[PDB]
Amino acid sequence: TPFEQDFEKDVAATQRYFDSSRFAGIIRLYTARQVVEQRGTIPVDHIVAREAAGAFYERLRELFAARKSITTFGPYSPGQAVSMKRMGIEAIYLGGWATSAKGSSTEDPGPDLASYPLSQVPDDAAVLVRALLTADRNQHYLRLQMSERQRAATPAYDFRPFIIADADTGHGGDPHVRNLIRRFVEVGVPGYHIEDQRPGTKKCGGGKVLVPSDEQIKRLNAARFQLDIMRVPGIIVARTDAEAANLIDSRADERDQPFLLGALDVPSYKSCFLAMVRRFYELGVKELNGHLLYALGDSEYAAAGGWLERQGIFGLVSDAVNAWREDQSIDGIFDQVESRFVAAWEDDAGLMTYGEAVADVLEMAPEEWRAFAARASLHAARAKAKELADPPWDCELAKTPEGYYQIRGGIPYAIAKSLAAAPFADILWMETKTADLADARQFAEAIHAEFPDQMLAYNLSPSFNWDTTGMTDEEMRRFPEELGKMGFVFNFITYGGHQIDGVAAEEFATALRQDGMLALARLQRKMRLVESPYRTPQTLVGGPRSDAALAASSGRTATVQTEVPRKLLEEWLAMWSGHYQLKDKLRVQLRPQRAGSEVLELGIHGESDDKLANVIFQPIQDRRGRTILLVRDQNTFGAELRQKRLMTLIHLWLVHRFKAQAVHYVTPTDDNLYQTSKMKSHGIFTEVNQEVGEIIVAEVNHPRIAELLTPDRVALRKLITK
Amino acid sequence: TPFEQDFEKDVAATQRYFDSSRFAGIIRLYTARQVVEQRGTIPVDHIVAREAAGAFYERLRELFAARKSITTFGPYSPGQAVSMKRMGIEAIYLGGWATSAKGSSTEDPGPDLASYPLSQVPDDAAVLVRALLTADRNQHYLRLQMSERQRAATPAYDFRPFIIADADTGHGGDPHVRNLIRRFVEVGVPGYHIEDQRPGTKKCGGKVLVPSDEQIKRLNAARFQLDIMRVPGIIVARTDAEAANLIDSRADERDQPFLLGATKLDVPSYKSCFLAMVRRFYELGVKELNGHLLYALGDSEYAAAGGWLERQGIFGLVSDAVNAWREDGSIDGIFDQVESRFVAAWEDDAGLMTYGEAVADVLEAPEEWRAFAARASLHAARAKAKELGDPPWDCELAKTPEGYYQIRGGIPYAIAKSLAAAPFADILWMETKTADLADARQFAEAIHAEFPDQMLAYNLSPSFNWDTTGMTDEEMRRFPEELGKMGFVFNFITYGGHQIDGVAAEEFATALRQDGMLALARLQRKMRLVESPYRTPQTLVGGPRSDAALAASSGRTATVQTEVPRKLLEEWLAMWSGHYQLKLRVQLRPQRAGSEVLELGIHGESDKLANVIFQPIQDRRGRTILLVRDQNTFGAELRQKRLMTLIHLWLVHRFKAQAVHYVTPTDDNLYQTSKMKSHGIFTEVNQEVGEIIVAEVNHPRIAELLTPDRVALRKLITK
Amino acid sequence: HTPFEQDFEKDVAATQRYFDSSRFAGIIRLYTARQVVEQRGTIPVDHIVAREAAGAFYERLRELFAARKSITTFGPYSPGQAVSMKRMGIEAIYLGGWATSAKGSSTEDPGPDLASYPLSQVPDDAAVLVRALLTADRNQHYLRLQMSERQRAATPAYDFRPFIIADADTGHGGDPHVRNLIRRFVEVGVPGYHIEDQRPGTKKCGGGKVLVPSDEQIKRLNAARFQLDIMRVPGIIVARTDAEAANLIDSRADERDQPFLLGATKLDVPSYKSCFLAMVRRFYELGVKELNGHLLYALGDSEYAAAGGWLERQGIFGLVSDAVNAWREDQQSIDGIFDQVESRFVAAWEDDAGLMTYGEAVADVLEFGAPEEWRAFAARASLHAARAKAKELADPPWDCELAKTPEGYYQIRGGIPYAIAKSLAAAPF
Ligand SMILES: CC(=O)SCCNC(=O)CCNC(=O)[C@H](O)C(C)(C)COP(=O)(O)OP(=O)(O)OC[C@H]1O[C@@H](n2cnc3c(N)ncnc32)[C@H](O)[C@@H]1OP(=O)(O)O
Ligand SMILES: CC(=O)SCCNC(=O)CCNC(=O)[C@H](O)C(C)(C)COP(=O)(O)OP(=O)(O)OC[C@H]1O[C@@H](n2cnc3c(N)ncnc32)[C@H](O)[C@@H]1OP(=O)(O)O
Ligand SMILES: [Mg+2]
Ligand SMILES: [Mg+2]
Ligand SMILES: [Mg+2]
């Protein structure tokens, strides 16, 4: 029948899609049939997400093969996102931290607990995608008005929405994951990261709680299912938080069981904790009534009480409560007692893995056993131990009051989780607090041993104090490239945008109160220097394309020099190039040497864009406002261009551009000594003092500068020829 | 009856509210009864907006009385808004430009045409208010954990939502205004600005005004909604009449004096000529230009216009243009040239002027007439002119194709509109493109002549090139204060936040590509130096208060030196203060915001005993030099005790300085650096008298003085 | 005392009086007045619609409780329906997540009630109702002002106060989720909220419902109260239990739930999980590639072997062979065929395992050898306390771990007794 044919046709198409190389080494726990029966008969097309996902995946695979990587941050505004693509960053990260911090019209801002509605991050992403698509439309409109020569000159920015967005823990079970993924896809997002935390306890700070691996895998599988239904080859990033986690909310998964901690004649950690809290309450700290949450039996309170007295913990409580009375909030005092209690309980309980426990008995080889225990279920490890050494071990004893089991968190556990998830994820990510290449290497090597083609991702916390690492500035510069080499293809400063937004606001708000409208002038100057699009806001937001739309809608019936231009020096260099018969049209560039620096670089560029000469300098003012040009470096790279007064022309421009009274050269070379001395003879400088190898100080000859700058260019013509 | 009593009680309360000094000189076109009728019986309370509006209004009145002002900008994020208040700016602006530029989940970003849903700016404002209220809660939580002495030391920021938000043109008529105002009030916004543009054509760049009666009705509608909600909201009336050339009606007597008309009435209508010109293009084979098909203009009108177009040589220009088009093979540029030339020709021949200027030309008392014409209806001016023996004048001839009348835009028209609006608005604002104190003064003086107590507001366009004004840097610094003196109490850089957001993103993105993770290190360093709250993000977003909430919810059952510290110098100054029998604090901040130039200050208990203004600079190999532009030991009795020598020792250690350069030294500087050479702090000292001192640091002697035993150091202090 | 200290002490005192008022008689808070005031900041806010509605609504329900009378209502699907029911004289409104799921939104496809909508969804729905009620009141009042005193006495005036109890599901996560959900309800004027003791990820309207421990439920209710206290709204907290129909729980850590745990008594049987996965793997190995569910887990060979042994003995591998042959003769979707086998397999496993509570287990030992005295002790006893009492004088073989589902959920004896146990634990909150 036509009905049966249409179905079989789509099942076949879907099967080819499944079997394509895009999904090599990916396991789906469902069939093409199961996907097609969800799609109905009315066509839909999520083309933005579909095409972005394709291109973005191919690009990441290209960089993984070249041992290269994208280094990015989370933009805090659509402007930031459009800007980073202008500056040539290839992809964007979008995180839940920044989303929490921003809030919304109905959401108060706050810490990242994924307590916002699951629509929150998609809604944020939607703003970014609309900004990128609008930027593309505005750019394209302008490029159509341009000629072929202008199009070859004026650069075209890539505004494709290569975004990997935060899907938290999935905000519940599989219907929540599918809904979250659907909302991302609908607004054009091609990548999503899901972590193995328990939704209710999700955090970024100590007591992280993991879920079993089967739960995490189901989240990833659910996501893939939704992506398949929507015909979008979305990039699924599996994050593990197992590196720092100490708790798990279930012990049902065999892969987690090797990492479980167990205790014995000791009473349960829960019993002891609650009994200790009850003692604080009975001694008159009414604030600590947490024991009312539980219905713990008398026998349990008795046993725990016994242990608490023997170990001297009830002693510590009595002392603590007396310290409290003599002095108010008991936050600090209780903390001290708890830590001491925990230390005591761990110590007495003999808290270790079932591996470590059977290893102690053996006093099968020792190292041979470890290998078996590390890949063995609890039931399988007990069966093998009894067959050989069945020690006392209970993980139930060590449960928290909530009922969470304790586990051995660390990179080995992160590896175990990530390896389990690898067949269901396109990218693996181990959450790190500290930036450390060795930790990253341990992870990457372990993964690649079993999955050589598995792409990885690395997070760079903005709060990690980089100056405590002991790394050199050069090691910091190279850190992203080092990640790339180990197969971390996508590395991101999570809420970078939030940080720079804050600093910018502090600065401008302070500047406005300090210097009034001069604060705006200085910002405008900065924008003119780097030739920012923000120079012309009306154009930036797409005024030209909008004007065109108004014309179409109505059938066309609707109704001083601020800085010395670089062009001036370019004209002088034309005279110069003419006299010495160079075929080379010389261009002048004046930008900060590095982004945001007061230190500028003036560069002279040929037709090939090879740098023929440069000056690295910064203007500085004295207390009365006089300006000095501090020169730290200068070069005439062409040996054939030297001793023709090229640098004398550049200096004349700089002195005019910056209204300089003097020029200081720090750590001069010999060439510098010879140059400044002869520039004294041409009359550019009145006086020149030189401490060989340390500093040159050259006072500007204002009359001679004024003479050379006369628009007739007579004196300037003589200087160039003689 | 109880029903009648409850009503009469609320009408009386409402009447007292109307009659309160808050609304002195304000006209309402409705009664207390009409307000109470709307309120129902189920209580509501918009307390955030109500209390903010009260405090914010009183504050602006203080500032007005003192001829001072608030100078602010539009924050582009909730972080920016919280930050501005930390830095001590008292109030916030929120504009439709930035809202348009940002877009939303369902709104593509774009130019400011007020084409977003009228919910858009309120939704944006809501984010800001939630950020401010949350900041207050986070601050207050921390201050409760502090002791009374810690509270007296740590400053408390004012996070009250003093916001004036953009209500555009009102997004339609009175039900639209009331809905817009309601949405602002509901999210806690206490101030709103409404402009006298036509909603459909609203712009920031051919502006079209509405009659004054329409604008007044918008302002009255707003007041009505605010009264219903018991919120004494601040209504700002904006006029765009300074730059506007068009108005969508000639029905209001107040606008009629400014109407432009043709004096040469043998000319055909501007509309006829424009359409006839377009039809010619079409008929000559440019199918693209079919704009004339929008209208059903008669043959007689096309003929008359055609006649004029041929005589003036415009049909000539069209023929030439179409030939240029064919030879090349889009006609956007070509048509534009012809149109501008056509417009020039039509304006020239039509003799476009006001009915005032027209009757003034005939009389050749002159200056007496101007005064009458400027305050006269069109019908009243004609009656007075005929009586005095009535030139040819038609404004209909000059209408655009849409049917908009031409008007004489400028400050006089802005004044006329603002004076009409004054009894219905708390603040008046004349939209300006250029920043000019004289233009502002002309406006302010004209307003204050009739309304001495009328508070004003002034916009500072971020796109206005300040360096083209010819003002000095010092004049730019003083411009806000000068506005304040003329009674502009609230002055704002509209989309400042949008601009700084962009610059910050460009810089960091460039820096990350240039310098990798060193880009983050440098940002972190900057934050540590100024002690920014962004230093500790978890705290900034309210982690402590949130942790407390988790504890409450669960009943408590839930489970290396980067810089040489200022404290080191403070300890040295304790030794020093001890020996000379005098508690000195050290401060190291940028001299101005974002500057590489730092100021080290020494502060007493009463707070500045000494300072050094300097900047570190590196040579090409990385060696650091301290460049000192100023230094003071302000107390004459504290001099020549080696206070400055201690500060220098710290700075040299803090910045790993190889040398110290002093630019434009004084005599005291010469004597100081020379003696510091003898103590062995410097090996070599070169001095070009009055220009520069260069002093090379003696590394051995520095190392000796920095030994933690403080033996050498103690000897240095005691002499 | 400084003004700062005074302002604080004043609000703490006011808050303490509020706590101690008769409104909260028999209510336990796991936090102090101080902890509430710390959260409020210094800038006043006022949720007056919710506050006043909550007051009147609570008093009214108390009046009806004392008179042994009640409100009978339904969930309106539109603001018109809500205004209409108040006209017809129904005193209060219910608003449920089922209808919200079925309606969808501009960004939410309609569907079954899995609480998979954003937690803003039901509050947003409630907001429409509250605005409709307040607008109706304003319209009525306007007309009544135009009327004479005689007409007012003639024409009836309807009560449009927003007496709503709205669905807060499971709380949509942990305590920050509950507090956010409650905040959103209060902000739009809703005075009542119901929270159920289901696991958020598996929430359903009935088959296979999964409960949470009672400590988790209590924390949800306490979290809600905390948020309501911060906002100065005496909101009505409804604790729902799904324990009457539920068969599963996601933890065995709470002593109150332990009496209802089901365990195997025949401990030579392999785990239900092992047997289920082994059965699925057989289908896969016999050529049904569709059924690859076993690839979700990393079950050991020893476990697959033991389970395999049991599956063959019980004739289940037989049923699989038959099923796969039926499949081949027809190779269409195997949904129906697999279902029969699994149903037959589940029955077999439940019957051979001897599934009962530790209560029922020790009761059998004593009935072979006081009996009714023990039941009373077992029904209120932890698992550790019941084992200690049984060893003292009959400690039979019993394992609840054997009976866990593949997800790791424990089986429990659902029914009215379990509903009672949960509800009694929740009652003080
Ligand atoms: C603080 C610092 O900048 S230190 C870093 C300095 N950089 C270097 O040493 C890099 C290597 N050197 C160079 O690239 C170049 O030689 C530079 C940049 C120093 C000078 O560039 P040039 O284009 O040669 O300088 P320019 O020609 O303008 O010099 C002006 C006058 O000095 C003279 N001059 C320049 N170099 C020399 C030299 N080595 N010997 C004699 N005279 C010289 C020129 O001939 C000219 O005078 P004249 O035409 O009247 O004879
Ligand atoms: C930095 C610039 O480019 S602008 C110039 C700086 N600012 C000024 O001139 C403003 C006014 N001057 C001053 O405030 C002070 O004189 C300063 C800042 C220059 C020096 O401050 P002091 O705290 O006196 O410097 P300090 O005590 O460390 O001086 C170090 C040595 O120089 C000597 N010295 C400093 N000033 C004098 C002086 N006027 N006469 C003689 N000796 C002096 C000191 O006696 C000391 O040596 P000694 O104690 O062993 O005899
Ligand atoms: Mg993989
Ligand atoms: Mg007024
Ligand atoms: Mg109760």
Side-chain angles (χ1 to χ4, degrees), chain B residues 41 45 130 136 186 545 550, chain C residues 42 46 131 137 175 187:
Chain B
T41 72
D45 183 26
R130 282 186 192 271
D136 167 71
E186 277 187 7
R545 186 172 65 97
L550 290 183
Chain C
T42 72
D46 182 27
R131 282 187 190 273
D137 166 72
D175 70 281
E187 277 187 12

Side-chain angles (χ1 to χ4, degrees), chain A residues 655-706:
Chain A
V655 162
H656 184 215
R657 168 66 176 248
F658 288 98
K659 311 301 171 198
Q661 265 48 234
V663 184
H664 301 191
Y665 309 71
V666 172
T667 316
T669 64
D670 286 335
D671 276 316
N672 214 297
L673 291 170
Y674 312 158
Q675 172 202 356
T676 49
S677 183
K678 283 298 281 192
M679 281 178 67
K680 196 257 175 183
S681 302
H682 307 155
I684 280 71
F685 304 125
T686 65
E687 184 187 337
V688 177
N689 304 253
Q690 314 178 335
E691 179 163 324
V692 170
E694 301 302 330
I695 182 172
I696 300 165
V697 176
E699 215 247 36
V700 172
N701 183 8
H702 292 306
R704 172 62 165 158
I705 295 301

